[PDB]
Amino acid sequence: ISNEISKLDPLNLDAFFNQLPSLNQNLEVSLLIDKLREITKSYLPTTFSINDALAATRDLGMIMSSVRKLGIQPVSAVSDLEVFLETLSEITNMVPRETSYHYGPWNPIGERERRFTHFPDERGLIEGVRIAIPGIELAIREINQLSNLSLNDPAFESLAKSAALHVYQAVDGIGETIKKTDPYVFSHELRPFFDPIRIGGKSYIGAGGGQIPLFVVDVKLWLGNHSPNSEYVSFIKDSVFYLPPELRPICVDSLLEPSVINQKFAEFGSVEITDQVIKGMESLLSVIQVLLKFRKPHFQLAQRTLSKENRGNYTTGSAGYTNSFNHMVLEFTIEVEKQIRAVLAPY
C-alpha cells in the first residue's frame, strides 16, 4: 500500500529532506556522510516493520544516491551501512536500494515529497512513475485473468478494456514528464542521481521508470516464452528481483508460458468466430495500442535527451542501455499490432 508507506518517516528525515536540494546544490558531501553515519548509530533496523523498512529504503537510498552522485561509493565511505542495508533488505525482501516504487508511489505527495534537487523538472520524473505504477499494477491482475476466459465470453472483452484503461495511466504519466522535464536539464542535473551503487560485493542500479512493471504486462500479454535469447528477456531477467515480491511469481510464471495473445491466436483460428469473439480479439489490440501510445512519445523523449545537443556525461539510461533498447521494445510492440490486425483483417 503506497499511502501507508508514503506517510512514514522512520529515520526522522523530514527536516533533512527539506534541506537536501540545497545540500546537493552546494556539494555539501560531509553533511550527507554525517547523516549516513548518524543513521547507522541512531537506529536498530531489526526492530522495523515491513512498511518502516520500505520507507527507510526510500529515504536512506536517496541519501546514498546523493553521495554516489558526487562520485563516492557511499557504503565504501560509511562501512557500517552494509550491515544496516542487509538488515533492511531481509525485512523488505527487496534490494538494498531505492527503485521507482520508493521514488514515485511510495514518495509522499506535497510538502514531504523527497527530491534530489530544486529543479521543477524533477517533478516530471516523480509524477510520471507515481501515476504509471498503480495503473499498470491493476492492469497486470486483469490481464492475468484473461488466460482462463473465452474470447466468446463478454467478460473477456470487459477485462481487456479495463486493463487498457489502466495502462493509460502510464500514458498520462509519460505525458506529465514530457510537459515538466526539459531534456537538457535531465541529462545535466538529474541523470547523475541514478548511478549504480556497490553494496556487499554487488552493484545495484539506480532508480528508473523502466522499473515500473510494464515489462510484466508485456511478458504475460505477448512476449511469453517465445523469444528466449532476446535482449528484452535479459533485461526482464535482470529486473525480476528488483520488483516488489508480490509481482515476482506473476513474472516468472509468464516468462515460462505462452503469452495470452499467442494462446488467443490459437483459439481464434480454431473456434466459431462470433461477434463476441471479434470484440474479444479487438480488446487485445486495444491494450497493445495503449502500449504504443506510451512507447512512441517515450522513444521521442529519450531521443531528444540523448541527442548530442542535450546529453551531458551519459550515453545510457540508469539501467545501462541506449535508445536502441527502447526502439527494440517498440518494434516488438508494433509487430504484435500488425499480427493482431492480420488475424482480424477478414472481418
Binding site for ligand [C-]#N (CB under 6 A): 208-210, 317
66, 107, 162, 181: residue in contact with ligand HEM (rule CB under 6 A) = 181
Report if residue 125 touches ligand CTE, rule: CB under 6 A. Answer: yes
Helix (H) or strand (E) holding 197: strand 197-199
Residues 62-101 as x/- pattern, contact with ligand HEM by CB under 6 A: ----------------------------------------
Residue indicated by cell numbers 538488515 = 87
Report if residue 305 touches ligand HEM, rule: CB under 6 A. Answer: yes
Residue indicated by cell numbers 560509511 = 78
Report if residue 219 touches ligand HEM, rule: CB under 6 A. Answer: no
Cα–Cα distance measured from residue 139 to residue 208, given in angstroms and rounded to the nearest whole number: 20
Q: Which three cell numbers stand for residue 334?
A: 508494433
Contact 136, 105 (CB under 8 A): no
Smallest separation, CB 311 to ligand HEM (Å): 9
Contact 113, 126 (CB under 8 A): yes
Q: Which stretch binds ligand CTE (CB under 6 A): 19-27, 34-42, 122-130, 250-258?
A: 122-130
| Residues 148 to 167 in contact with ligand CTE, rule: CB under 6 A | none
Rank residues 109 and 149 by Cβ distance to ligand HEM and give the closer one.
109
Residue indicated by cell numbers 520500505 = 54
Rank residues 9 and 189 by Cβ distance to ligand [C-]#N and give the closer one.
189
Contact 265, 234 (CB under 8 A): no
Per-residue 3-state assignment (H helix, E strand, C coil) for 60-71:
HHHHHHHHHHHC
Smallest separation, CB 114 to ligand CTE (Å): 11
Q: Which three cell numbers stand for residue 236?
A: 526482464
The SS3 of residue 72 is coil
**Binding partner of residue 101 among ligand HEM, ligand [C-]#N, ligand CTE, none, CB under 5 to 8 Å per kind?**
none
In sequence order, what are the beta bridge partners of 197?
Answer: 204
Triad 244, 4, 194: Cα angle to 5°: 50
In sequence order, what are the beta bridge partners of 144?
Answer: none
Residues 76-115 as x/- pattern, contact with ligand CTE by CB under 6 A: ------------------------x--x------------
CB atoms within 10 A of CB 312: 13
**Binding partner of residue 251 among ligand HEM, ligand [C-]#N, ligand CTE, none, CB under 5 to 8 Å per kind?**
none
Length of the chain: 347
Cα–Cα distance measured from residue 113 to residue 108, given in angstroms and rounded to the nearest whole number: 5
Q: Which three cell numbers stand for residue 263?
A: 494462446
- Binding region for ligand CTE (CB under 6 A): 100, 103, 125, 128-129, 191, 194, 207-209, 317-318
- Binding region for ligand HEM (CB under 6 A): 125, 128-129, 132, 170, 173-174, 177, 181, 183, 186, 208-210, 212, 214-215, 295, 298, 301-302, 305, 316-321, 323, 325-326, 329
